[PDB]
Amino acid sequence: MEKETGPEVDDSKVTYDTIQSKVLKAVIDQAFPRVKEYSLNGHTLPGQVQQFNQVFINNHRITPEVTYKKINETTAEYLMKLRDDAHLINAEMTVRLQVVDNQLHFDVTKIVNHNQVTPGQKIDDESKLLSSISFLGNALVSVSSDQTGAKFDGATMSNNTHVSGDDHIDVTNPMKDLAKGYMYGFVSTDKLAAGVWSNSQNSYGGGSNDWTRLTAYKETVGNANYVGIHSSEWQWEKAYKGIVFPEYTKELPSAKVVITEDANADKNVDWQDGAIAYRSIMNNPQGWEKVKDITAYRIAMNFGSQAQNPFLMTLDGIKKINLHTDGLGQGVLLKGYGSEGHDSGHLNYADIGKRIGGVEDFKTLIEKAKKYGAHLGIHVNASETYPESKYFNEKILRKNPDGSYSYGWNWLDQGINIDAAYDLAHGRLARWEDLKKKLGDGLDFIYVDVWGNGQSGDNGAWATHVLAKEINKQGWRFAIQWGHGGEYDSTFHHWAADLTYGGYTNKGINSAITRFIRNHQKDAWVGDYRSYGGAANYPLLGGYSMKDFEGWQGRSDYNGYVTNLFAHDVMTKYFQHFTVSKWENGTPVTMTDNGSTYKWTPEMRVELVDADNNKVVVTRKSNDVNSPQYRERTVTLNGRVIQDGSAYLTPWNWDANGKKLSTDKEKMYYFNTQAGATTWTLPSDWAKSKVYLYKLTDQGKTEEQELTVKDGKITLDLLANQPYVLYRSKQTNPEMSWSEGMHIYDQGFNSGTLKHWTISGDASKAEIVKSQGANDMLRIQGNKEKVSLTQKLTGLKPNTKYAVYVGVDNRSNAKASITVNTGEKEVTTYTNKSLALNYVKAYAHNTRRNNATVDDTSYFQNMYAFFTTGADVSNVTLTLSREAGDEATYFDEIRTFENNSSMYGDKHDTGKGTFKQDFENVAQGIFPFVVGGVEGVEDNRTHLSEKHDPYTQRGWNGKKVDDVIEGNWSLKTNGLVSRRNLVYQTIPQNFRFEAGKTYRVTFEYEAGSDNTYAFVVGKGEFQSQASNLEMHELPNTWTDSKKAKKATFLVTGAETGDTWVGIYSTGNASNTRGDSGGNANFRGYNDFMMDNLQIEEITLTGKMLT
């Protein structure tokens, strides 16, 4: 390429003025808000050196009519009249340029559109809107190839671990052309660096073209090439289908430049100095301050009406983690906080799940969690909904160009995507407001799932900023699913934080420039996941690694959760307590993974600092990618080694909420992924102190040991993959008030003792034991007389109807019971040997081997008693008992909660009399049934369906069957046809068909096809050696009927006491009647619904005999 030339600059017709602070002077054109040049400490950076007195309004070129006024020494103002009759533009905008110390601020302070526009109302011609304002062509700052050290550095979005989003371009003549959008951009000489911020929500496309709030352009002027950074175009008045968006969607255009000399004392001026200075002018995502202290993120899941994780139970998990981490901060995403759980009832944000304890228990959870530094978030959806939801309406649904529905997720029900632009234009904001009104204060984050994938249409930068602003206005922090989503406002990205998702192309933001700037403000980065290579092969700053134990994707591994916190997250979060100050790359390495051999340039040393001038230096141990030392670092704090390779001994000076600790509470954490002794130099304020070591378990600080300090050093030779904490004085573990608000002490057997129970019988026969998943449970075995454990149920309301259950897995034939005595009445329920395996994937005691009870299985099922308090609640007792037997019964999770069912002879309490289930007041699950093994351990596709006429009922969009038969609720199974397996069954603890007694079982049902589902009678444990079943295939209910059909069956209890009834998915093919895809799922061909179950003990007389 040959040396380039362009027009020189003739400014004979230009009048300049100057504005200046004490440190920065800007030469500005009086004709147009353009900075020609900046001066700071005798050094200069050009701005826009060639006049370009045009703007683009609604993508039309306009020569503005400008009047100028210098307001004060630092500030000038321009009134800019905009007229283009042919394109219906008639407007004016006021712009101010203002110097603030070493910053230049560009603000559009006022916009007047002379066309009549009313936010929220119809507009007959959208071209009358003033929708976009572009000052492209006027660089806010630049650098010339004639200047020494001229360079440009910019970041674009990349989520591919192999591909950096950053460009580093020497500004030379000649050079390659440049006309490209960027998220962050810096120009620098060897004397000055500048960074540019804009609130522009411009996009030039997806991927690396998105979030492009800046545009960099090469311009040749005389004999020099300039690279300038421009703000990308801004948005203003916008509409959807002629309906103008609300006023809050309009944000006045703003951009800033900051100019700096050396800012990290390395005696070089480059983009890193610009990036440090940039933190003073940049947007900061709301709630970012919290991020550095949220060390323990995880999901607590509810799903399908099951109430796997009641709000008050999550508080006990928080307490376990508080103990085990010695008071690290936590963030629990409640996936299923609403409606019947996860993926139920979307859009009705205020519909807080009733079966998990409703708004009352959610408020208690939020309030009580504060002292443990545990922040709650909720999973919501702004992209699709289901007929059941209050907000399902034809008007909100997304339709394809051909008129068909844009079908969304199908799982419990078939959802339809919504049109998010329509939604914004029609009151979306009020749904968030309703949630805030109901829930009140203290919720931390809203996690918006899906958004960013286009299901609901445009989910790009502008639309996401609007959505985030609605959420932030309620006081909530914004979080999203995708690595590329919400770059401007998000503080957490599930696909960045869960390293296992999506593979190497779908992870966090692969940009050193971006991470340098924002590492401390969000979990949005590339974490350590060696099999993805590139940036993910041992990032020096770590990167959040999220695991779970409360049911998300069937995750139950508590111990693995805690070890992962210490293996990845403690040091990740430690670094977020500082800001990056220096970043040094090494030489390129060659890697091979994921089907490619590629070059990657790794970071070798990163320095960070805090406001107290602490200095942290993180160094990769080798640049050799085939050496084990490539995946090792040293970390020093003010020169003192706190990590080397597999081990760290790290100070931690912040409480769970991030507040500075008192001197006597300052501590150090030790963790080593390998066996072996390590030696550490203590800091001066520890070196002459006594030092105590504690092993951290789910019981808190254990195995106190005073350490020997020699020559101001300690040596630690402790268990691998095990957290320890050190203090300078003896520490104890606090009272945890286990299960507060749940009416019983320690419902999950987490407190390491049974002393709060009154035990009747031989106490040696009752012990707390660990399941195969390390879940603590009460075990009773080997007892020759009854053993009982009793507590008072405390804090109950007088004259109130309640349910209580205990999870029970009984391996003995002996009677295992739950008994409530209210002071005025006693009720009891029992099980002999359990006969139904647990198939609820989000439930901690499902039958997956790694959270099995014992012998690789789990038969846990909730065993209920229903009772009513009298006038006095000072002596209500709960007793768990086990009659004589050799084998074990396991109990866990005692939940006592208000419930208004009337199942027993039309009365609430456990008692005699006809059994009826109208599904209108179910405590949880699908009682008296429990989900069967049709889908194995699954987020089971059977749940309680909720009525929303007409959408859930026959006739809407051709629906063949009602989701709900009578009242507001039925028992629905979605599409589980042709499976040859049991969908659900009664179990004797829920309903016992007594030996030799005969019952009439009646229910009403919908079935979308003939003989796809069958009513079945079984006994004992079902085996799919397949079990004998009495089989009654059921006809469809709509081809020859306008409503649900009634079915009636006689069932005699087997002498073994283990008879049950259920619904079975046959081997027959269903019939979708020529429909396919979403229509076929929606319309219910493959569905089964039950309601109005009745089971009545009868004596066979007269014609019953036939």
Ligand SMILES: CC(=O)N[C@@H]1[C@@H](O[C@@H]2O[C@H](CO)[C@H](O)[C@H](O)[C@H]2O)[C@@H](O)[C@@H](CO)O[C@@H]1O
């Ligand atoms: C990975 C993730 O968050 N995916 C979302 C889906 O989540 C799935 O939800 C179903 C139940 O509906 C089940 O629990 C799966 O295990 C879980 O991965 C789902 O919420 C959809 C809804 O459109 O969004 C994501 O794909």
Ligand SMILES: [Ca+2]
């Ligand atoms: Ca520097």
Ligand SMILES: [Ca+2]
């Ligand atoms: Ca437990």
Ligand SMILES: [Ca+2]
């Ligand atoms: Ca009903």
Ligand SMILES: [Mn+2]
């Ligand atoms: Mn439903």
